[PDB]
Design a binder for this molecule. Sequence first.
Ligand code: HEM
Ligand SMILES: [Cu+]
Ligand SMILES: [Cu+]
Ligand SMILES: [Cu+]
Lengths: 659, 660, 659
Amino acid sequence: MQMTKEAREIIAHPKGTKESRGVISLQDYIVEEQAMYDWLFKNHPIFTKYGGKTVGKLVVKDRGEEWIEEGRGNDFSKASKRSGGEGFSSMMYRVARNSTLQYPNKFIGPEKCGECHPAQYETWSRSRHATTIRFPGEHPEVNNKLNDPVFDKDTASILPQGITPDVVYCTVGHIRTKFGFFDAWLLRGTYHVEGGLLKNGTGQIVAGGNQWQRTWALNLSPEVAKKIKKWVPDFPVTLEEYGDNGGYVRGLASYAAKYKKSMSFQASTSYCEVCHPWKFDFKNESEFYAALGNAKELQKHTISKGVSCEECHGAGGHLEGGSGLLISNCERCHQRFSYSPDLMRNNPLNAGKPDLALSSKFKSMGPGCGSEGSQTYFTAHYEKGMRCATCHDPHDVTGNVTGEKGIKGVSYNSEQGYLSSLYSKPKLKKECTDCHKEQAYIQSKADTHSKNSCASCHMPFMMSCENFYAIQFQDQAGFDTQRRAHIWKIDVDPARKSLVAGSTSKDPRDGKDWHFERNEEGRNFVDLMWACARTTWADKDQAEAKGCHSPVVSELKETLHFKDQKQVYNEVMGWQTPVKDKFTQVKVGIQGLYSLLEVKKLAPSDKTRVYELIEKAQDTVDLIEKDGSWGMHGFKYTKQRLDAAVEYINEAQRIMKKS
Amino acid sequence: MQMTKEAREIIAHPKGTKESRGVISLQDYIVEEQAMYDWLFKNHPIFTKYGGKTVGKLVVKDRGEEWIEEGRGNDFSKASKRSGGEGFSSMMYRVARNSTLQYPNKFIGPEKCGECHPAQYETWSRSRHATTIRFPGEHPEVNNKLNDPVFDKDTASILPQGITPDVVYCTVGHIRTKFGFFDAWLLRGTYHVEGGLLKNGTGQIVAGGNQWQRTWALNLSPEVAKKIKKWVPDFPVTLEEYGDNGGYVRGLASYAAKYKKSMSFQASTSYCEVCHPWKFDFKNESEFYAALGNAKELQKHTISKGVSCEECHGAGGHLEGGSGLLISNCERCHQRFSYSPDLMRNNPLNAGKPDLALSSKFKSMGPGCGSEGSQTYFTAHYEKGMRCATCHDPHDVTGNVTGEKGIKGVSYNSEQGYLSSLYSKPKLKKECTDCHKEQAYIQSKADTHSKNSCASCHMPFMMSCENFYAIQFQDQAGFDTQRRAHIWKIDVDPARKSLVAGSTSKDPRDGKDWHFERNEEGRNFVDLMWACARTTWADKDQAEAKGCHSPVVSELKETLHFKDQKQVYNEVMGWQTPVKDKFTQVKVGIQGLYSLLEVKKLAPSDKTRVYELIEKAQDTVDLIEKDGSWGMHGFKYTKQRLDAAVEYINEAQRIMKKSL
Amino acid sequence: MQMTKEAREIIAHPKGTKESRGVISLQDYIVEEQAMYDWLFKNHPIFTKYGGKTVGKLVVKDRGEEWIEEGRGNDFSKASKRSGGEGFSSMMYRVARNSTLQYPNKFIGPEKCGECHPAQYETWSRSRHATTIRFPGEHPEVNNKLNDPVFDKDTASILPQGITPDVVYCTVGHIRTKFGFFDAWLLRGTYHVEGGLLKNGTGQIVAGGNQWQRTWALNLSPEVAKKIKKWVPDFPVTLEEYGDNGGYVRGLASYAAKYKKSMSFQASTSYCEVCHPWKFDFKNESEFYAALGNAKELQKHTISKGVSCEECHGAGGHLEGGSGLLISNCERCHQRFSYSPDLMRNNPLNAGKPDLALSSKFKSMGPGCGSEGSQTYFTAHYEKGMRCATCHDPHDVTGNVTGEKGIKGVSYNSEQGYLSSLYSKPKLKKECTDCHKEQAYIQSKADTHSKNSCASCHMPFMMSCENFYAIQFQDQAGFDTQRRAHIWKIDVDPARKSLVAGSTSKDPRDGKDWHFERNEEGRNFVDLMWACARTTWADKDQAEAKGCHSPVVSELKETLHFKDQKQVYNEVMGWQTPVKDKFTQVKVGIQGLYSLLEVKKLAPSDKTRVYELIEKAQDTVDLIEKDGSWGMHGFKYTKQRLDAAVEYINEAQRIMKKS
Ligand code: HEM
Ligand SMILES: [Cu+]
Ligand SMILES: [Cu+]
Ligand SMILES: [Cu+]
């Protein structure tokens, strides 16, 4: 057992700044983790109780790999002029302030910020930022039964087999999408126990079957899976067909682990403390390591859980003795840059500019949760100065969502506010209609999609939280679809996809180097299958609008179930072709007449009329060009205006003739 | 004599973070005040020279009550899941950085920021932020006569009877609204001395008669009071009629005190250092306590006065050795939340969300000064991400206001720029017209209110700075009206009021738990009485527009003096009803015609014409809908466009008729 | 040799705050410099090897003069109530954080910020902020030949006579405009050496001939000069006619010096560290003074060069052990206020308000480079809350600019991206057309200037980077024109000038107290000569649009070469006068028809028609009024459109006739 080679090379020859400059920087964080892994190798029960034997190999994954190697950081580093191409690049995972390995820290806890800022405490406290980290006893949404089935009695409990609350420090997550756990040794829970209990050192440690997944447990029954299989012939139906991604019961999937084959061995320090953090109140590291291995002692000494005030604003915020106030830009946890060699090779003028080949973290073939920032970085919105806080309230990030009263589960409790909810409804400072007036105007007119939100087409749930690759069939715009894309640009095309395999991929399902495609303007885009026909169980708008056009969840008539991108493109063109044809005629007419007002004299009263008509026709052209949807924001009204405008041009042309 | 019970409990069982974490938090600030109060109980003249005897009882009011109990902080705390409902909530009064009890501090003074930032120093220095704290010798606007009448010889001086400059550390405030003072022991001036001078230990300490009020001393003469009384029969005229709120001479009211009945005993450290601060340059606390009681010594060692650069930006700003730069969001001094159990009770959807039952500090029955933030918090503006500095320049907060040459006073001096002025004109980055273009366009059409500013209707002076409850008659939108409401939304209703009494109120004027009402969108709103017919002497726009529709100050004909809200509402309906009616006709016509074009056959040029007409009508409807005032921004223009649009629709119907 | 009197006075009676308060402030910076000047008076080669003898007088200029006296700080101070009118005002030059005289510092260098922020590193690293300070060996754009001619073999090399790379700490600047150098003793390069080499202490120190200038070396050949001479009689053609401003070869001018007459003696600490900084990693001031005089040692210990992350964001940024995160408002280096007594005197409503009499730094008769801030301060834009970061990306400040392949040069290499480029194209978040919609609409119509940017008219290159006063003829809008004015408001007048001499000026070219004029709204403005007819070689838009109307560089026909402002004004009237005529005609008509409508009875159909026509004409009027250019944004569309509105009025009249 040892740390990753990358970590060991840095430990052997470190070039941090803590000792030389008195300022901590990337390499210092890599170095400081050595003692934690030494401790775990001697003290974790996998070794003390199970003799280092597991069903599946242990694969150590420390900061050396996560904070340096992920997102092809080493390839990015080589493509950069920084440090002569010999440097390191932390693409996805890193902290801005001290890690949980430094004691003492200056955290005072959110309740103390709340004494003076009760208003923000209240909104923050009813958000998933506040409860992403929770202890046993803090799950009223499952009546505090972490080991009983949540929904149907043949589906999974939140905790895996053999894992009981007394050896769990915390759960991570929510009913919203999924849960994970950390054991009392603060080791990421990538395993379960068969034929025994971790608590007693009995049975066997088995890789995988460690991650509770709401959609698989609740929505994705074998019956639903058979329905998908009619359309997608290789969709897995039985548990065994979920393979390495699955496990022993539906709802508990293998994550950072392949069922019975391999499992990551990872401290919270290496990864999870970047985005689902906690802080302890210990005065020094001796106190910390003494408690390490007892959940109750660690819980009692926990001064901050989850994404609290001070995770965003800094320890002690602006207070005297604190570490200095920050205003988060969200990129610690919501950015997730991933360098793509394929995007780099699109243009020779990219030489020395590898930032132009950044994409987003992908979980196998889907863009990963927490990648909204790397998505928005290649949008017109980001170019125009817009950031997360432009649109989002940074405190009330969950909104007034509630549980599902029609769900009859063995443990599920629908009455616990947002904790019971399958959805998110973040509080917004800006709606699309605030900035896009012409689009709002046309889309407000009574028509096919006028009831739907702008976000319903423009912000599909493309993102994978669970890395449930066994159900990722991305050309069918499903089925591992749990977070919302922040791309906005919709591409209208019969074939071009948003998501593409890397050129290193040797099998269409191996998931190698997937990335977002870039359009002609160098921007990310949403293809029409995602925009119109995606299948998801995370999207409240979709569920309130008859499942949109998904062959799996649509309640529309079968001819409006969109089964491939070309079909969707055909529907779009049914509206766009007639709009563009009339649009062109009108503009052709407007020039036909403007120019021909030099080659003819008219009775002043006819001249007035011709001017008047083409001026009104020009108003319609401008509105439609500015709208830019070519009828997709409202065919009926767009056609009404274009019909009028061609009448104007014909009336004017009739007049010009009589001369 | 002792500190409040709330402070003593926290001192007895403190749960701050200074010792356990090395970070100062709320409870540490409560604890640190113990020494100051012990000192005051032994060393203040009230005790050393007057035997602790005062006319009216002494009421200690330290941070334990001000920073913990105010705004029903304890009820908010019990309504919250935070700390199992057993925590504390500082609703209004707290600091962000060290208080004036820490020595040494890192303040260098605004003149030092000004060495490198001369431009911002200049604009800041000509603002009331810069001069809210002043020493004797810094009042040219009264020819430095703090003890002679400011205006008429029968009205008040700035300092009350028995209080002389040499025992005053500072004055607080301006001619703008009011003044207060702090004695050389840094105790808040809630008293005067009858038959003697404080400096000689003679006479008697008497509660109240301590706050100079411009509006009472200048504008609210017995003559004006009598005029008001014809409308409002209970309105006080004689000095005796102002009761506990008054005192011994028109212009000096009792504030944080009741004349001869009670007076707050309060160090500057408990309350005033939050919003009207100063900082001293002492190396340690021994030096500070040694200077205490000596105005000249304290003044000499004052390194920052009032809302200086570093009060906003932190002590030493971004400089090496400083405390770290801050950009103020203004909530230290301009927010003032107050929790309203009635707003919780009346909306059951707010259960477990005490933040949605937040209101503003009320001074009796009017929202307090410095509550703009708690007001804006419940507006569309704040919801769209707008904050104070969206609209406001943070430095030039007073603007180019001047005195009134027409005022002849015993001491008043009109030539001192903003210091002489009765008004405020903060420099703005954004005007209403920058974001509300349709409203601006219609409003620019010459009519009844074309010379009104947008803020004249939308931002009435509803706020009470002085807590002059004796003249607060909120249903008549007067008469203690010194600061500008930041609410904007105008409600259109015959009876519904912006301001209402709490359910604890047992008498229409007892002033218990008054608060803002919330509309169907969960927002604050301005009722039509405030928007149209309010009475104030702090609103220059109103003074320059014939006093608007106030029965008391309107110069308009008597038929345009609005005596109550139903009368205003009926005037509004007279404009909105015709507009709304015609708007509805035009909108139905447009849609009806569009629908009929889908089936009824017309010659090409008729179809052309019908389309053309309904598109023109649609332009008009879109404009008027987007404006959303239904004629209140420009009645004749609005109805004219709609009358023209009605003509377009009728011609279009004429064409449809021919076919049949 | 000694420090300036202003410095010595402060040193004698210091009222800083470091000792009393523990906080560094302005006067502390002045005092701290004393050791450096003592050291230079004893150790610089000028004294140790040349015996204090120079061709031209040594003029010491320290922080005492730069940070205190510049911009008429003492007059501003006296005009202010601050400190009784007896204090100091640092108008242009000061730092926010420790100077380069304090050791150790907390800088970790931009490559360490880049480890975690690879994206911002990439865009920042290809900007002139990043390379404004460079060491010998880092000039691929002249093939690293600092002593060979850049362009033609009879024009200048970057380094002057007798100055070799081995005794130069760094160069300042780029091909873009100009270069400068610092010797190994960190003295500002205001001299060269005739008859020997500085490294051997041979030859004589000669004042001036020290600043390499791109425009003089490349563009302003004797032929071009002759051409300008035909329009401007006094224009210098021969090297000798450039006088004190010139030197011994075309391309190397005298700056902070007069050729063979005077040269400033200035440490980097007094001035250049404000805006073109660097930082050393020295652990104390002893290590620093020990390396002084050795270019290689200093270079080896340089941890930050130029305007790096930490110069804007503070040393160590937000990192633990750092000095605390900043977000720069750019005023350290781009503001440059200069108090103008003339502006104060010429408006007695500004009495007691010297801030309102602030102008910008002028380099002789042109506004200085890095005065964008003091310029925008008196604009509508600043008043509305706009700041540098409203329009600009703060990282990607240079943009995708490239060299010129057509240039023949002895050393010039045109293939090093932005390093080879003569232009700047800063990345913007907002374009003029984002906020100014009506102007954008009119300007989009195919017409005379429709291909041109808004910035082309509104932001001419008025600013002097080089103080090349020998070619400054401002009434002719030329010819020392290297940076872009940030004023936007164009004044339309036959004679009023943006740039005027101070009342202390005696000769029209003595360059005394020049300043911007203020218009009737208290704002800076651009006169029509600058807007339309200016001569520059720094403006890419101008170069891509036939040199605009410069008599010197225009490729237009000769009737479109504008020689004076009166001629420009007249061309503007050619357009605005017909537009305002028709405009007024329409307003009169609308008002007339409207007044008649209440006393006139019309058939329902006739009335419909008159309202409608009036209403169309009103829309046109509103658009033209909103545009506010009266044809300057597109004469053809504007005039055509007003003509039609006249027709609407005329048709309305024909219907009103039936009364
Ligand atoms: C889309 C590009 C442009 C934008 C957004 C823009 C914007 C503006 C604005 C906002 C004004 C002020 C109008 C007022 O006072 O109400 C203006 C005036 C002016 N612009 Fe432009 N402009 C553009 C292009 C141009 C061009 C190409 C030229 C010259 C060829 C030009 C020359 C002027 C002049 C001379 C004025 C002064 C008008 C007067 O005061 O009479 N502009 N422009
Ligand atoms: Cu996730
Ligand atoms: Cu007040
Ligand atoms: Cu320059």
